Amino acid sequence: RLAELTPRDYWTIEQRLSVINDTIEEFSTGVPYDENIEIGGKIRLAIDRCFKYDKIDEIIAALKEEAAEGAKGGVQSWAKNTLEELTQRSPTSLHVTLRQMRLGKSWGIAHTFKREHQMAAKFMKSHDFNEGVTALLIDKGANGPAKWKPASLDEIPPGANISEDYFRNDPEVPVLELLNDRSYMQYPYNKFGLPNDYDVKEAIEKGNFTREKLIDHFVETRRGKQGVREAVSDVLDRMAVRSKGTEHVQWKKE
Amino acid sequence: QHYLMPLRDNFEQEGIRNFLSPGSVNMAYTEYQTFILEKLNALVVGTDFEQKDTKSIVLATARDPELAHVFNHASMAHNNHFFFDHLSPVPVKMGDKLFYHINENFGSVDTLRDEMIGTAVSMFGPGFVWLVRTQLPGQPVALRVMATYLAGSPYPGAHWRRQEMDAQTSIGSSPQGLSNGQRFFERSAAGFKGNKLEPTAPGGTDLIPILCLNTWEYAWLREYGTGVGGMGGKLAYAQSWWNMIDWAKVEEEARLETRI
Amino acid sequence: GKGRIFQAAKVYQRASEAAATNIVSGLPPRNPPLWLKAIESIPPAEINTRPYPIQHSPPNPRARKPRNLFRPTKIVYPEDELRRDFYRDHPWELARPRMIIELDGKDARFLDWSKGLRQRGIPLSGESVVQRQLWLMENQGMTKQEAYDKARHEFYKLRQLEQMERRIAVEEARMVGGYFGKDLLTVGMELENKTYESWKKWATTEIARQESARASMYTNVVDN
Amino acid sequence: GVSPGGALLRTSRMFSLPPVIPPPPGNKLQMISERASATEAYPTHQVLTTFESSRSRGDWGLKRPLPLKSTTGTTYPMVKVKEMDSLEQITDFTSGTQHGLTLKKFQALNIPISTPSEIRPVQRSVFEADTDVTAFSPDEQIQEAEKRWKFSGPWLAGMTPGEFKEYLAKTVRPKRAEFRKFIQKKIAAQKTEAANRELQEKPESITDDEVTEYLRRLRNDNQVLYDLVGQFLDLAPLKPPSPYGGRGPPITHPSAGISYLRTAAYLNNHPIYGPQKSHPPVQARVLKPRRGNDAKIGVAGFVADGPLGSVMDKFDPSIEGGAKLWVNVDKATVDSTGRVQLTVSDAKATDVLIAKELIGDAREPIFGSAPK
Amino acid sequence: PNKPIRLPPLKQLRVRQANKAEENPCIAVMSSVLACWASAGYNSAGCATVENALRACMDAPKPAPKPNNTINYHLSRFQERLTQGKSK
Amino acid sequence: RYIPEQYLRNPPSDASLEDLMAAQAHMGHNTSLWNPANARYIYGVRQGIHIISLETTATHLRRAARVVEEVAYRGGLILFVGTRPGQRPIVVRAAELAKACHLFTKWRPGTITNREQLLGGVPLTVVDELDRPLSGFEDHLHDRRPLAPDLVVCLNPKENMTLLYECSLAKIPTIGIIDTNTNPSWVTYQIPANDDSLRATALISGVLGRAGERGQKRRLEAAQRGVVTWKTPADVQGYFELASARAADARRR
RNA sequence: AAUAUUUAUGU
RNA sequence: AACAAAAAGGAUUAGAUACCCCAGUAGUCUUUGCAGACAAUUAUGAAUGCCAUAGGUUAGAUUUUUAAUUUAGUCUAUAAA
Ligand SMILES: [Mg+2]
Ligand SMILES: [Mg+2]
Ligand SMILES: [Mg+2]
Ligand SMILES: [Mg+2]
Ligand SMILES: [Mg+2]
Ligand SMILES: [Mg+2]
Ligand SMILES: [Mg+2]
Ligand SMILES: [Mg+2]
Ligand SMILES: [Mg+2]
Ligand SMILES: [Mg+2]
């Protein structure tokens, strides 16, 4: 079907994407009936309460509270499993990874690749990469688990900053020369997926939709996209309250 | 499929204060009604009754002898819920209009009480005691008491399964025995041939069950025990039941003609 | 070549060209039909193109020049073999009226054949025995005969209880003053009477005709 | 790997329709009528139903809605679909009450099905693990083979001469090599039963020097060999040296699905009179009187020979609606041809009046009025 | 024995005479009268009973025509569905 | 979970694979009575009939629902055509939702190519953005020639081929339910499904009815904001410049 | 149901 | 033996060689040669590759041989053409 679509030479890039979006939705046979949103409700909220800091020490500290029985979150199972997965990875990558998540929100797509080039160039010289790859891929589980140079995160003292070296471009590595000169701070067309918290928020500020009347607004606006009713409902259950009874619906963070 | 619906005023969670324990109502309605409905579903899982309500099944499968087992579960579910939909957490004050109608048909409010309770114990068997509202074409609205056996139905459309009195202890050679026996054969003969003994108004508007009393043993033999020595048992169950009758609702569904 | 030429798949192309220029040269074209911009980005789909249809069974690997390559194939499942085997051992199982009309099509969402024959939504039929048989024959690694016996025996014990309820229910009802209508046995005989009588009339009428014919056939032209 | 649309069709209700089973096998060497055909012994198609809400619209879950003239008005909605879409662009269907209601009639008699036994009327039900079994294993002996009812081999006496030749040239001949192995496995035990006691005081089953040593010893005793040949070809026992092998094995399960009751050893408790001696009588028709020998009677749609005993003797056009007599069904069983043969025996007199009492047709009531 | 063929495309599927023609019943009674005369005599006594039957005929009124048969209408409906189709 | 008259009281916005299968939309004609050209939609063979792929019907149905919405959103005249014994309530219901015209009887040959004679005396009216009458076009409603549908939605293309051919001749888009024996080259947008089932026709037409309703809403919602989603038709547009031409004489004289 | 006479011409 | 050009006779007819009739020779048949012309036709040379379906039918094969697949012929009705 995609081969049949013949756009006019004077159509904007937006129209071309709209034509394809509507075509991809004609072949949707419906999402499963029993499969529920994995990262939603409690787990989704826990992620926003344990992955909002800029230090791995604080993140693990928050998870321990959730893991400890009696917490009001109710995700003791997920929290305990997450800690086991975080304590089995290179502590250097954790500090370095989390560092670019906070700075990555301030870079452009073009500047991102250039920095990642210098960033990934220093990993080839490090010891963790050469150890992890050789231990878990080449040896595929033989000789035991990978031995990271810092055995654990606690070893790294609080004041130490091992994430600084991996963000300093060196002269011996030339800056990446991209094939073109285009760039953008935000994605130009990333609104064809299910409506996320960003779309539900603005929709509530421009209007005065109700609990159920707001869900239908996205359904008809999305032309019946599969999963809009469940996705939008989930967002309201987490980041919305019953402000003026049934009629108004506002966010939680005041 | 038929699914269990919640009760009136949160009884499944707390149960009536001075009538039934929260665990008794749990075994009386939640665990039993679900059992009946489970059996009922399997019987109408692939029939026309798959999407019909209980009452529709009670009237449709009344005369057919091959669907008698289906009528039991249907009428039992209806009669059971009908009994719980008339109670209340706290006793309600009988209405003036209803209070005056009862005296005109039974002499006094308590005279009817001892009649229903007396009929429950005298019956000595699982059944339901109904307070029906009978109105003939030209007769005024008059009330009366009717007793139904294991899964009897008070509605006229199901007269084929009214099950008002037993045959083992009411059909003999005595003067009353012969009379009762004749009526038994007259009904079966008329019902089979299709002839109707008592004309009925269109729409089954003759009898309108207002109140009910589930005398089945599974509802009281746990809360009130057997009743050795007269303490508790079936007798006390019927007495305590009289205190929780939602007389306000009993008056609304009665729909007594304005006469005062 | 008798049939007419349908150019319905080119209405947009034809209609758009007719609106590009005006008949009266030198003037701007008039507004096009209101539907020209509605289906602008919804072209028709390719039709009249025979593809290789889905093969529901392995094609003959021995054919050196096979035919019917563009012919849809028959849908065959493993249950088809079992259905035929069951309903032949129980022919009167087909007299049990079964509904094939679907309510919402979601009856398959609640069928867990690991529990037993009794499921939600579907009645106890010969199909429940086949699916239960197929499940055991696959998960529990049972043979066609072994799994058949197991699922088949569970079917009997359930059918027995249903036939016992009818008898006990009617008898129980009459002990407390319960009367029923005409049973199917009596109703069936009354219908046979009405039909038999009609045959008696026809036979009586035909019998008269045959005997009368004999009188006319014999020559009684002269009476002496 | 199956597509989502194909996964729903597999579980569809229409796809569950079983294939049309072959009709009840009749005598091949006999004449038959060409155009007119009556009701068959047992049903070959599936009977369909709908909701009374949809029947008013002719919707039966088929290709197209059926006509309302020929499918509405009756009490029990039943339809048989020969073809969902014929060459005339129509659903070739027909009413299903002929067989649908005959099942309800029979099941209203409350009589189980028994195993035929040549003529102490000991009745044994069909649904018994002792006999109702189809799976087996090589350790099965000929004694246990008499209990089964589903053999994979044919019945020799029943097969026509031509059919017997095809069986020999298509199933028995190419099984020569495999049969020799069957004996090798048996002879592996012939050697080891010499060690029956060697330990208290099997070989690899390949010896061409042995399989020939055995069969040559069985030419003097042909009986022991036939029993050995039947095990390999799954042939129902024929000679007595038991499970009613005279007429052949049943082409269907003995019950045939008509009724799954196991015993009639119950006493229907009458409301007034109490537990009765016999079962309630049933009025039967009279077809083909004695005076084309023998008498027939229509008992609940089925045709069975009259009781051992009048209306039956001669045809009387005077009786209204035909000659109808009350009778009790004693024993019912399924024939090797698939038919339902009822051993019907005349009923008593008082029971007929006891039945008419409830129905109301009893002219003289037995209760109260009866002085003696 | 082969089965009936599928009719080729015809201009119209119909029966030439839908309604059965009922032979005048009294041409048969006349044939009998003509038989008595030949065997016996023109002016005899054995012919009285048969001649009266012939006189009873022509005195009786003609029966009413039977209702028209609608076979040709139903054949025109199922023509294309039963045969190969229609021609012309 | 099912009522016979549910596709009319509240038809569904979209059709799922279960709704299509429950409505017998996959039952094709006998294997012999098939158009080999339309074999691209057949899934297989069973019960002696051709099974139309449920996924092919849902895809072709949603695509058609998009055409009905856009045509109704641009002020187009739709015509729902179902000509069968029991297809009258279905077509009339779908026309009400989409504010379109219905046809539940035999199509008179020549109502499009010879509209001048057939639809000569039938009255018309001139409306505006918000679909309300405009006084001043009385003289235009006597010389104007009759209308023609901008989109014909046939529910039985096999029966009435005279209507579809006129649409092809008249350059009108068409939507039809193509059965296993129907020629797919007769309509512009095919909907492979069972057309003999009165339950499948109600679902298909119901979905298309909701589409028009959803399209008419957007058009009216966009008109209240002063945003017309369509320009004046060519015939009416011509009567404008001539109107001022007559008024030009008033200014002159 | 297997009937059977004869009928040329026309700027 | 029978049939039957020719020859001959009897009728029909305005006339009748003729069509019809009573009869009847070559010839049809056997054997051995000559002769080579036919609406000797499918008004269509033989052969090879290739193109979508349907309903019959002929001789086989396979199969859960009931009924469906399949090879080589033949005949109706159609699609693209
Ligand atoms: Mg069709
Ligand atoms: Mg001339
Ligand atoms: Mg001559
Ligand atoms: Mg001559
Ligand atoms: Mg001669
Ligand atoms: Mg030569
Ligand atoms: Mg040549
Ligand atoms: Mg052929
Ligand atoms: Mg030939
Ligand atoms: Mg041809």
Curated annotation (Swiss-Prot), chain C:
Belongs to the mitochondrion-specific ribosomal protein mS23 family. GO terms for molecular function: structural constituent of ribosome. InterPro entries: Ribosomal_mS23_fun. It comes from Neurospora crassa (strain ATCC 24698 / 74-OR23-1A / CBS 708.71 / DSM 1257 / FGSC 987). Its main location: mitochondrion. This is Small ribosomal subunit protein mS23. It is found in: Mitochondrion. Component of the mitochondrial small ribosomal subunit (mt-SSU). Mature N.crassa 74S mitochondrial ribosomes consist of a small (37S) and a large (54S) subunit. The 37S small subunit contains a 16S ribosomal RNA (16S mt-rRNA) and 32 different proteins. The 54S large subunit contains a 23S rRNA (23S mt-rRNA) and 42 different proteins. GO terms for cellular component: mitochondrial small ribosomal subunit. Component of the mitochondrial ribosome (mitoribosome), a dedicated translation machinery responsible for the synthesis of mitochondrial genome-encoded proteins, including at least some of the essential transmembrane subunits of the mitochondrial respiratory chain. The mitoribosomes are attached to the mitochondrial inner membrane and translation products are cotranslationally integrated into the membrane. The lineage of its organism: Eukaryota, Fungi, Dikarya, Ascomycota, Pezizomycotina. Keywords: Mitochondrion, Ribonucleoprotein, Ribosomal protein. The keyword Hydrolase does not apply. It comes from the Eukaryota.
Swiss-Prot record, chain F:
The keyword Cell division does not apply. It comes from the Eukaryota. GO terms for biological process: translation. One of its GO terms (molecular function) is structural constituent of ribosome. The keyword Glycosyltransferase does not apply. One of its GO terms (cellular component) is mitochondrial small ribosomal subunit. Signal peptide: none annotated. It is found in: Mitochondrion. Keywords: Mitochondrion, Ribonucleoprotein, Ribosomal protein. Belongs to the universal ribosomal protein uS2 family. Component of the mitochondrial ribosome (mitoribosome), a dedicated translation machinery responsible for the synthesis of mitochondrial genome-encoded proteins, including at least some of the essential transmembrane subunits of the mitochondrial respiratory chain. The mitoribosomes are attached to the mitochondrial inner membrane and translation products are cotranslationally integrated into the membrane. Component of the mitochondrial small ribosomal subunit (mt-SSU). Mature N.crassa 74S mitochondrial ribosomes consist of a small (37S) and a large (54S) subunit. The 37S small subunit contains a 16S ribosomal RNA (16S mt-rRNA) and 32 different proteins. The 54S large subunit contains a 23S rRNA (23S mt-rRNA) and 42 different proteins. This is Small ribosomal subunit protein uS2m. It comes from Neurospora crassa (strain ATCC 24698 / 74-OR23-1A / CBS 708.71 / DSM 1257 / FGSC 987). The gene is mrp4. The chain holds residues 144 to 396 of 428 of the full protein.
